[PDB]
Amino acid sequence: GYINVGAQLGTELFIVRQLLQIVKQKTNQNSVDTTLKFTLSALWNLTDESPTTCRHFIENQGLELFMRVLESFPTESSIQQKVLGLLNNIAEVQELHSELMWKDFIDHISSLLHSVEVEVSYFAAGIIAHLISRGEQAWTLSRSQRNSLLDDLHSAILKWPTPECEMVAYRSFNPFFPLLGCFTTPGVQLWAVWAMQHVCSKNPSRYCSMLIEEGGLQHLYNIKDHEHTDPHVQQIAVAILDSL
Amino acid sequence: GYINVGAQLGTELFIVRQLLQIVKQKTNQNSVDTTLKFTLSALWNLTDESPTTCRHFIENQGLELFMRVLESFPTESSIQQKVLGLLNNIAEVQELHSELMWKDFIDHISSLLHSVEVEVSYFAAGIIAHLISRGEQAWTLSRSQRNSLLDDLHSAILKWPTPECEMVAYRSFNPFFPLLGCFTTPGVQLWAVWAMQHVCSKNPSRYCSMLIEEGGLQHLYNIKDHEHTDPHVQQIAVAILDSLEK
């Protein structure tokens, strides 16, 4: 039994609200506890493929709470991966795009995009890739930054070694397929195919089939035979292809 | 994206721990507020048809804390309803039966059975009907208390007025069906049939179809033909029968 029809949703957004509180007290205490990392992980996981959870996160001042954990724990890369991992999930939500066009934010993840630790800059890239993928009209901050970041995206990826373990898990590749078509912005394209290549080669049982069943092959073959394609994007896309 | 495959179980049992802590903190400040009430509601909903959550609750000192909740707010009937609704979900998980064989726990539930609020009494009854259902074998507490609870369970159900609104929600009637076959212990069936009639009465669009789909009719049709049946248990049988018969 449960309390009333339609009440499970309110319970989940309440849980979000309480987790964010635990984040706010751990940050006031400057206390990098296991409870705090458990909490950032819970938030991260609850925003996976949940625009509703993501919008609740934004409306409870989450974006500013998290800019503040990034500034309070500058040397904590585990904390930085979970923060940015969630912000990557937010970045996937189109209607939340304007909410992320804040300058203290872009400027911060833009710093993290140049972290040499792929477990941190992979998600900073994901955020940026998703935002740029809208671009033109949608970019309401420094048009020089968008054009700058588009090059920093493309070049940070080239430097990335392959990760030790899996840094991330996906239930679906659908949020990547819009990126795959962004020929005019090759770093956007390059993060998506790099992302796909990474998870497929670490755990092909789960992901190679997922990739094929959601039509990913179509998109990858589409990059390949659209031969006016960035060569680094072509490189990875044909490497994902000849592996299936 | 999310942290790693199969990690939603660790995060949700972490949630159960953090909610229990908020209960502990609100109880400690005598703060009966929206946070406390949301947190009880959250624990209630999270234990719905979820033996892992029920077990994590018991393994993280849930039972002790919730009785400390009943003892701290003895007139807060909204708190009591939520507390007893969770404990009713736990009373459904047979693996957990023994963990609820604590006389101090049962004393609380027996006492709340006599509440003048059906919204509170209904859930004490539910914990009791399920526990008496497990059979005199699994009842590691007194037999003189097990039987008196059956007389009280049965006589309480017949005192209850029609509640104003739906008191509870369910996704499946399955946990009730074993209760329907307790011809030995009538008040246990009476809770089951009263509860089904309550939700069909208040929300037939939802429950009249759910009850039929899950094979509830044959369980009721068992009660209509078995002639050595409790009369009150039998009359609710037929009234639900005809109501479901559209």
UniProtKB/Swiss-Prot annotation, chain B:
UniProt-reported outcome of changing W44A: Complete loss of N-degron binding
What GO biological process, any one, is recorded here?
protein quality control for misfolded or incompletely synthesized proteins
* Chief place where the protein resides: cytoplasm
PTM per UniProt?
(Microbial infection) Ubiquitinated; leading to proteasomal degradation in the presence of herpes simplex virus 1/HHV-1.
Question: In the UniProt record, which is one GO cellular component term?
Answer: Cul2-RING ubiquitin ligase complex
| Lineage: superkingdom | Eukaryota
Location comes to: Cytoplasm
Q: Which UniProt keywords apply?
A: Cytoplasm, Host-virus interaction, Leucine-rich repeat, Repeat, Ubl conjugation, Ubl conjugation pathway
Q: Does the keyword Repeat apply?
A: yes
Reported function: Serves as substrate adapter subunit in the E3 ubiquitin ligase complex ZYG11B-CUL2-Elongin BC. Acts to target substrates bearing N-terminal degrons for proteasomal degradation with the first four residues of substrates being the key recognition elements. Prefers Nt-Gly but also has the capacity to recognize Nt-Ser, -Ala and -Cys. Involved in the clearance of proteolytic fragments generated by caspase cleavage during apoptosis since N-terminal glycine degrons are strongly enriched at caspase cleavage sites.
Which family, according to UniProt? Belongs to the zyg-11 family.
- The identity of this protein, by name, is Protein zyg-11 homolog B
Gene assigned in the entry: ZYG11B
